[PDB]
Amino acid sequence: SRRTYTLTDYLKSTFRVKFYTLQWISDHEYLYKQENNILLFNAEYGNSSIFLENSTFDELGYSTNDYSVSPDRQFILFEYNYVKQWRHSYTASYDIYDLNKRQLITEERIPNNTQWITWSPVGHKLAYVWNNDIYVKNEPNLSSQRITWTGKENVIYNGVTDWVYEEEVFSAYSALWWSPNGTFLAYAQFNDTEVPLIEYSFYSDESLQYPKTVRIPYPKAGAENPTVKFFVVDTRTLSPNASVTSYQIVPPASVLIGDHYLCGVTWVTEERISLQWIRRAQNYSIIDICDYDESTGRWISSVARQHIEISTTGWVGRFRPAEPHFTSDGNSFYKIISNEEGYKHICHFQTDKSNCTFITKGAWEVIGIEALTSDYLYYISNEHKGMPGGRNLYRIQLNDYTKVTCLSCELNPERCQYYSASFSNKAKYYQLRCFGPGLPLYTLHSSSSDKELRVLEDNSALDKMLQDVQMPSKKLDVINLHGTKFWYQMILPPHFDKSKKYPLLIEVYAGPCSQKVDTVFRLSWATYLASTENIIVASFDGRGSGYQGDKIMHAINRRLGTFEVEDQIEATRQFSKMGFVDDKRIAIWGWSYGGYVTSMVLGAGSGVFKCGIAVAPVSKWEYYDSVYTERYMGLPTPEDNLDYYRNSTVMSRAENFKQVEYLLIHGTADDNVHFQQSAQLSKALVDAGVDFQTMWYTDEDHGIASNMAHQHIYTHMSHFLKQCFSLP
Amino acid sequence: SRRTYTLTDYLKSTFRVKFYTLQWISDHEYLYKQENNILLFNAEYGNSSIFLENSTFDELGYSTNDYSVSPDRQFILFEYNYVKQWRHSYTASYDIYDLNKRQLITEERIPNNTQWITWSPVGHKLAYVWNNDIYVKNEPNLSSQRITWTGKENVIYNGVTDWVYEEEVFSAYSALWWSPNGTFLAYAQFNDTEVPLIEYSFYSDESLQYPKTVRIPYPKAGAENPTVKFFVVDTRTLSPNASVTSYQIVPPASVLIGDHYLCGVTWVTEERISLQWIRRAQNYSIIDICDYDESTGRWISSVARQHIEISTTGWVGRFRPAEPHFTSDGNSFYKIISNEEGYKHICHFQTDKSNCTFITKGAWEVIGIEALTSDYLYYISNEHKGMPGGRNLYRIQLNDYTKVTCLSCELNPERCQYYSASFSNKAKYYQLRCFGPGLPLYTLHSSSSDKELRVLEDNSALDKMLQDVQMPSKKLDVINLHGTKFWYQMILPPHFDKSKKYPLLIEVYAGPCSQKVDTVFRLSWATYLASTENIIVASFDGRGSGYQGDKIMHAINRRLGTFEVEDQIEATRQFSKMGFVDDKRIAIWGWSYGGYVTSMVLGAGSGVFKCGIAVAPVSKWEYYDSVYTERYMGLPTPEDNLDYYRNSTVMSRAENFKQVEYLLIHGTADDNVHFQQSAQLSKALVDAGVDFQTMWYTDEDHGIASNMAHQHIYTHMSHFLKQCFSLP
Ligand SMILES: *[C@@H]1O[C@H](CO)[C@@H](O[C@@H]2O[C@H](CO)[C@@H](O[C@@H]3O[C@H](CO)[C@@H](O)[C@H](O)[C@@H]3O)[C@H](O)[C@H]2NC(C)=O)[C@H](O)[C@H]1NC(C)=O
Numbered sequence A, B: 001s002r003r004t005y006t007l008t009d010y011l012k013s014t015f016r017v018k019f020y021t022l023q024w025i026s027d028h029e030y031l032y033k034q035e036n037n038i039l040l041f042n043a044e045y046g047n048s049s050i051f052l053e054n055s056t057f058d059e060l061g062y063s064t065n066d067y068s069v070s071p072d073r074q075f076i077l078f079e080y081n082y083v084k085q086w087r088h089s090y091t092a093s094y095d096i097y098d099l100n101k102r103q104l105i106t107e108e109r110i111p112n113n114t115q116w117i118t119w120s121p122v123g124h125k126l127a128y129v130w131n132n133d134i135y136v137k138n139e140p141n142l143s144s145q146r147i148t149w150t151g152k153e154n155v156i157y158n159g160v161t162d163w164v165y166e167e168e169v170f171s172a173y174s175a176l177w178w179s180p181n182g183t184f185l186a187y188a189q190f191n192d193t194e195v196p197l198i199e200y201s202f203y204s205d206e207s208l209q210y211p212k213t214v215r216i217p218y219p220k221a222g223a224e225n226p227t228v229k230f231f232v233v234d235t236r237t238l239s240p241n242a243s244v245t246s247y248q249i250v251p252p253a254s255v256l257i258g259d260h261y262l263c264g265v266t267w268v269t270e271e272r273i274s275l276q277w278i279r280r281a282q283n284y285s286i287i288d289i290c291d292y293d294e295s296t297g298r299w300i301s302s303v304a305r306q307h308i309e310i311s312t313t314g315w316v317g318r319f320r321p322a323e324p325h326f327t328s329d330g331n332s333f334y335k336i337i338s339n340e341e342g343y344k345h346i347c348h349f350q351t352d353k354s355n356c357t358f359i360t361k362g363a364w365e366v367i368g369i370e371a372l373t374s375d376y377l378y379y380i381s382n383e384h385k386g387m388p389g390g391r392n393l394y395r396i397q398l399n400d401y402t403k404v405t406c407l408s409c410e411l412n413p414e415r416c417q418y419y420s421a422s423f424s425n426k427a428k429y430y431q432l433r434c435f436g437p438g439l440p441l442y443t444l445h446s447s448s449s450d451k452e453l454r455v456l457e458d459n460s461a462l463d464k465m466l467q468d469v470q471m472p473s474k475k476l477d478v479i480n481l482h483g484t485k486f487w488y489q490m491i492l493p494p495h496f497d498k499s500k501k502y503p504l505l506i507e508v509y510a511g512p513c514s515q516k517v518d519t520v521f522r523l524s525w526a527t528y529l530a531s532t533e534n535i536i537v538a539s540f541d542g543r544g545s546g547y548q549g550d551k552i553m554h555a556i557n558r559r560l561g562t563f564e565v566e567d568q569i570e571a572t573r574q575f576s577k578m579g580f581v582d583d584k585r586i587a588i589w590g591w592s593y594g595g596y597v598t599s600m601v602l603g604a605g606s607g608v609f610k611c612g613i614a615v616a617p618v619s620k621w622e623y624y625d626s627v628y629t630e631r632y633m634g635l636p637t638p639e640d641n642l643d644y645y646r647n648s649t650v651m652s653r654a655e656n657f658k659q660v661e662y663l664l665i666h667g668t669a670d671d672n673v674h675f676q677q678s679a680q681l682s683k684a685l686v687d688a689g690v691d692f693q694t695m696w697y698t699d700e701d702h703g704i705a706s707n708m709a710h711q712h713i714y715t716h717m718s719h720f721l722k723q724c725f726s727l728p
């Protein structure tokens, strides 16, 4: 008999899952890193030529973290000195190389500690942020022109997001957007003057005698939020002895009236820009299409060019409103919005008309719009086979919504049921990325007749390797809760014995619009637990989960910690009846919202779970950030939703932990879910005379992802579970 | 059958040990709190009368935390609104109550948040500290006179100590001293301007949305230290419109030359004061006796009145240089110093001459000088039976040092071997306090006849309750390590069967001048471990331990973490050979320095210990305070002792932890041994791939003493030990 997938196999990634990352640079060509050099492929034929010899990297005096070729191909940025900040943010040093002269620009260099940098969409202009201010370099070798003067550490950010905007609104650090042709440079200014500071200790290397205190303007629920300003700069007049020509665009009056967020920016044409704003409440957003007035430099908005989007049952969009996809000429756009029935579908809008027309419909949802031509619209949805945890690429005819074809559905039906796509510049070619249920598969296709063209990466090596290991099997199925069909997944140990009662581990996320059940292939900790430790690992998507319509997703609106926690319990009760499950050994674990749900479940007193592990959990919503929290909970005031904020804390269920074995884990430098959350929960448990276990991870943040900490937590969690399940 | 002493019995103090706290107020009277009344006792004839009826307390309107009667018995101070700060410091509100007119002073009340307050030694003058400044009230009903104007939060302290002086030098918050007749008020001023701040999070009550950051000027080893100034205020001129008459006394040149500490103050007569100073190196201290010059108001210092004390093998004194005890006239004094053999004994000094004469001698040590009269000196020593862990009261005739009597040695030889004493004014009577090995016994005696007069408290009630429980016995004995005899104690389970093999827990402190082996009776966690769980708990005092001469104590000078750690290992190795120890089940635990030694031992790779628990340990000397650390280690510089600071960290031993089960515990609000110490240690263990267990305690300080935390830590450690010993 073979061997099993071990914890070390997981921790050291002994079984490599290959991928194929390419960067389109034209309607038919893409850059790809092979053996350290940047190759240039011609999708059409498959022939490649060298674009940058690995040799050039060696001659640089540092490790190249990332590269970015200019749109006209005359220059390339070299990113080094990478220093991570939050989830997307970081600082770095940059060198600009001249691909013509095949030399390295040395005059007027990009500054040290640059916060963000980007080429214009055409040519080779540059805009970057340094010390919270924006700078523009029209030519690599020329000196930069300062765009903003208000930048102030921890107070005013120009061109980059503050903490909450990076994490909860844009999911990006960048807040700069060049116009299609480089005339205009739009940017947002964030003002955190009145945002309270979260403070926590950072111990750093053993050599530091006194700990450092980290301070971050971070708006917790109901607190003062950062304010925002959007401007469009006319770069044509940037001159050393000239002022900066910029125009401030404000949101329509229906949002300007109170606290709001800027949630999206889309350039339509050189003279048309679409701004998307949302009220602080987040159930009311509006798109404002503004046109440039050549005679005054103003950006004008009109009531006819404005489009509202609200939600009466919940919040708008999944984590933010979906983005508008404009036609080439900008006279109309396609965007995903909720149906009359609550399902997210593509609607066609006239830029200056309010009524829109849905072009897709059904008891399923469009995930996103991937590409748009004059003739077609390509999108991703979970329509196929009615499985919401599946994803496929579809193409619909614009002049006939009856003609919709599925480009990926039948390519490899057993191996591939979960895809994402990447199209070349005018959608003439697309790369399909299959993430499971079988081994990932990357392939290239021509939009003309949808020919397979060629395989880019098929993971044959991993496949050869895995046939010698006793892998667990993954099965998806459905169970009915309160008249609704909900999906679950179970990772089952190899050589499954129906007569044996296996211990069961429930892995949970369960946050609003979460999806823990899908057909994605993963080599994870659960793979190990099932393969070597014979533990069945299962996940369930109940009320509050996404991609199945707003009736399901919005079910937990204003009441986080109720129906989603309850469904995890009821679903587990059903699993516990299966003959091959040892109902006396059921555990539950989760990270983040999953840690919160795990804790609420253990504190429910259901008698269904023997033990559980919460990693970096929210323990009280008033401790989490304003943007995410308020979106689902409203404000913690008696006039709004205070009662539901107060009875949804983990601390309120403290007494009930006397019935279970609990492991609470948290990184001390978590800037996201503050260590404070676990500190407050451990204290209430201690105050209740409840015994449990904890594990802090010094200086680790929300991902507890440094190499050693990562190995350590999974090793520590595996020992705790084995002890809970009486496993040798 | 019988009950055993349980964890709950320990945690809830079911078996109460009683004591008898009294306050001498004259040569033959003392106050005592009984049934909440303040009683006035007459030692002569044993009769008693009510000094303050408890009715008074009931009429107050707040919980009276404590009280202090004025020396002339006309007023009484009531302390309420007590709020603890560090180990000795706290703030409170105070009412003054007139005993004659049995009414409460309501005019010119003492301010709230007062930091320290004390009556003058005679009369009823008051001196108090508020907002870091000193104030004097000549009468309870009169407005106070401000004495200092430099008070400043976290910077300048007048009349009270800063953090390090409080914890390591004075072992008190108070820094003011009235002269015997109340003429002068001396006080020290501490300047923390250049002391770095230790910063850490305090989460507070669950309702606090954002954690607060605590900041304390705290000097770590080798860092900038607080500076001090000493003044004597002539209180006779205090008047609403008069300036403050004061004189600054500076240390002698030999100490003034560099960083130093004021370590003690002793009023000799109304016109003579003794200041004791020590160099930052702490192997050099000097006593400077200053005389008041009536014609100029200054306090004059002279070389003939200066006395130097140094140490060539280590530091001066035990934790500070011993204090001088002056005769009534102030022409000579008695003080404990190390003799030529390295044993601490009483030397008689002439105030204006440098040579002294020893009045005690032998291979044992004087612990302290308790009282002094024109004809006798009373002291406590461990001479009896040659056991360093025993304590007795002796009286030596001043005109004939060969004449010494032991006053407590034979009162109750079996029950009482560890005494402390408290003498009335002029040493006419003394209360004797017996702490073990039997149950505590408090007695009152007459000094003229040395008759026992009466038993104040004999704990006969506790004795009765304990006859019904299976109590463990405590045995003290000796072993030889490298040719030197050292003491150890073992708490043995009831019905100790010399033939069975019991698990063994080593409880360690082992810091410089520590004494974990004594004849004190204690109802502890260990009592429960022996009585209920049948675990032998042992302690051992090896190299570095105190009360056995400098050769033993100074053995670890400049090398903490070496010999005392090795001695714990070798002694246990010998214990494991005694026959009744299950060598497969030996553990070690300790708090503070003991937590440090516990960790160094586990990291030694001796294979002797299966597991250990360290509570709030030091992990690296450079992280601990300057006063304590430098005393034994010198400076962490390559010029001085850096090499020994560097290889004495627990982290340097991380790799050896892979062989043991370890539990690391620390309170997050520990202001003494910063959480940073365990946080840096766990980070090193994670980095080395070591699995271990952790337990933080939210908002708990160095004592992890809140009621619920106390129960929680011991319950958690019991579970861990029992699991390590395979005990159900
Ligand atoms: C205020 O003072 C009066 C005394 O003047 C207090 O009354 C005394 O209270 C104590 C404590 O309850 C009584 O003692 C008890 O005696 C029996 C022995 O027979 C013993 O079993 C108990 O353990 C305890 O020792 C004492 O007899 C009683 N004395 C008088 C004169 O009544 C009163 O309690 C005080 N007020 C408060 C509320 O503290």
Ligand SMILES: *[C@@H]1O[C@H](CO)[C@@H](O[C@@H]2O[C@H](CO)[C@@H](O)[C@H](O)[C@H]2NC(C)=O)[C@H](O)[C@H]1NC(C)=O
Residues within 6 Å of the ligand: A150, A156, A191, A192, A193, A194
């Ligand atoms: C950032 O926002 C703050 C408001 O919180 C602005 O501060 C105000 O500025 C005006 C004009 O300078 C003053 O009259 C107010 O007293 C300020 N209020 C506060 C709270 O300071 C600040 O000007 C904004 N900064 C930018 C660049 O827009």
Ligand SMILES: *[C@@H]1O[C@H](CO)[C@@H](O[C@@H]2O[C@H](CO)[C@@H](O)[C@H](O)[C@H]2NC(C)=O)[C@H](O)[C@H]1NC(C)=O
Residues within 6 Å of the ligand: A560, A561, A562, A644, A647, A648, A649
């Ligand atoms: C907070 O309180 C609400 C209202 O009492 C709880 O909602 C109820 O939950 C029970 C389930 O035990 C249902 O049977 C009721 O119908 C619910 N009432 C409402 C108004 O919907 C809610 O569960 C509590 N939240 C938490 C996290 O405990």
Ligand SMILES: *[C@@H]1O[C@H](CO)[C@@H](O[C@@H]2O[C@H](CO)[C@@H](O)[C@H](O)[C@H]2NC(C)=O)[C@H](O)[C@H]1NC(C)=O
Residues within 6 Å of the ligand: B560, B561, B562, B644, B647, B648, B649
């Ligand atoms: C730090 O290093 C010193 C020097 O090597 C250690 O002291 C030696 O310890 C060995 C083994 O116990 C003895 O045999 C040597 O005689 C010691 N040398 C000296 C000069 O003392 C010391 O133990 C180390 N400190 C720690 C905590 O490991």
Ligand SMILES: Cn1c(=O)c2c(nc(N3CC[NH2+]CC3)n2Cc2ccccc2)n(C)c1=O
Residues within 6 Å of the ligand: A149, A241, A242, A243, A244, A245
């Ligand atoms: C838009 N805009 C600007 O352009 C601008 C500016 N501040 C400056 N300078 C700051 C110090 N040097 C001189 C002024 N300029 C540049 C400028 C202004 C007017 C004429 C020429 C150049 N601010 C604060 C601004 O908001």
Ligand SMILES: Cn1c(=O)c2c(nc(N3CC[NH2+]CC3)n2Cc2ccccc2)n(C)c1=O
Residues within 6 Å of the ligand: A167, A168, A319, A509, A511, A591, A592, A593, A594, A618, A624, A628, A673
């Ligand atoms: C398991 N889990 C989560 O829970 C989760 C999550 N992403 C989010 N949010 C969207 C991105 N930014 C804010 C958080 N959460 C929800 C959450 C995280 C932490 C605290 C509270 C809620 N992901 C990607 C995830 O895998």
Ligand SMILES: Cn1c(=O)c2c(nc(N3CC[NH2+]CC3)n2Cc2ccccc2)n(C)c1=O
Residues within 6 Å of the ligand: B149, B241, B242, B243, B244, B245
């Ligand atoms: C010793 N001494 C003092 O006495 C003193 C003082 N500061 C004051 N006052 C502060 C505000 N009111 C007036 C001055 N006084 C009191 C005082 C000085 C001179 C005559 C009368 C009263 N300082 C700083 C000082 O060191």
Ligand SMILES: Cn1c(=O)c2c(nc(N3CC[NH2+]CC3)n2Cc2ccccc2)n(C)c1=O
Residues within 6 Å of the ligand: B167, B168, B319, B509, B511, B591, B592, B593, B594, B618, B624, B628, B672, B673
């Ligand atoms: C067990 N243990 C200790 O260890 C200890 C101690 N007292 C001290 N020092 C003297 C008084 N105040 C400062 C510390 N330490 C030694 C120590 C404590 C914390 C860190 C490093 C050394 N006590 C009374 C004690 O019982």
Ligand SMILES: *[C@@H]1O[C@H](CO)[C@@H](O)[C@H](O)[C@H]1NC(C)=O
Residues within 6 Å of the ligand: A035, A036, A037, A054, A055
């Ligand atoms: C550069 O490319 C060559 C093939 O063109 C390859 O053999 C070589 O390994 C590469 N250099 C490296 C190791 O970066």
Ligand SMILES: *[C@@H]1O[C@H](CO)[C@@H](O)[C@H](O)[C@H]1NC(C)=O
Residues within 6 Å of the ligand: A040, A041, A042, A045, A047, A048, A049
């Ligand atoms: C591919 O080959 C064709 C010739 O058929 C050539 O024109 C084209 O430039 C090549 N592209 C690359 C990048 O190799």
Ligand SMILES: *[C@@H]1O[C@H](CO)[C@@H](O)[C@H](O)[C@H]1NC(C)=O
Residues within 6 Å of the ligand: A240, A241
């Ligand atoms: C801009 O101003 C600077 C002032 O030093 C001057 O040297 C430069 O020539 C000016 N630019 C022009 C040509 O207008």
Ligand SMILES: *[C@@H]1O[C@H](CO)[C@@H](O)[C@H](O)[C@H]1NC(C)=O
Residues within 6 Å of the ligand: A281, A283, A284, A310, A311, A312, A313, A634, A635, A640
């Ligand atoms: C939007 O949310 C707010 C909660 O702050 C609520 O009061 C308001 O009625 C909501 N509007 C809609 C359309 O439901």
Ligand SMILES: *[C@@H]1O[C@H](CO)[C@@H](O)[C@H](O)[C@H]1NC(C)=O
Residues within 6 Å of the ligand: B040, B041, B042, B045, B047, B048, B049
């Ligand atoms: C004790 O009795 C003596 C006389 O016998 C008396 O002077 C004294 O005041 C009494 N003490 C008390 C406090 O009762």
Ligand SMILES: *[C@@H]1O[C@H](CO)[C@@H](O)[C@H](O)[C@H]1NC(C)=O
Residues within 6 Å of the ligand: B150, B156, B191, B192, B193, B194
């Ligand atoms: C405190 O010390 C600083 C130097 O560290 C000095 O500047 C300051 O004046 C001192 N303050 C007092 C009141 O002694």
Ligand SMILES: *[C@@H]1O[C@H](CO)[C@@H](O)[C@H](O)[C@H]1NC(C)=O
Residues within 6 Å of the ligand: B239, B240, B241
């Ligand atoms: C002190 O001076 C004040 C006025 O400044 C006056 O009212 C008061 O009477 C004076 N007190 C004395 C003791 O002279």
Ligand SMILES: *[C@@H]1O[C@H](CO)[C@@H](O)[C@H](O)[C@H]1NC(C)=O
Residues within 6 Å of the ligand: B281, B283, B310, B311, B312, B313, B634
């Ligand atoms: C006191 O310590 C210093 C510095 O560590 C040392 O140089 C000196 O020799 C010591 N003094 C004596 C008398 O040992």
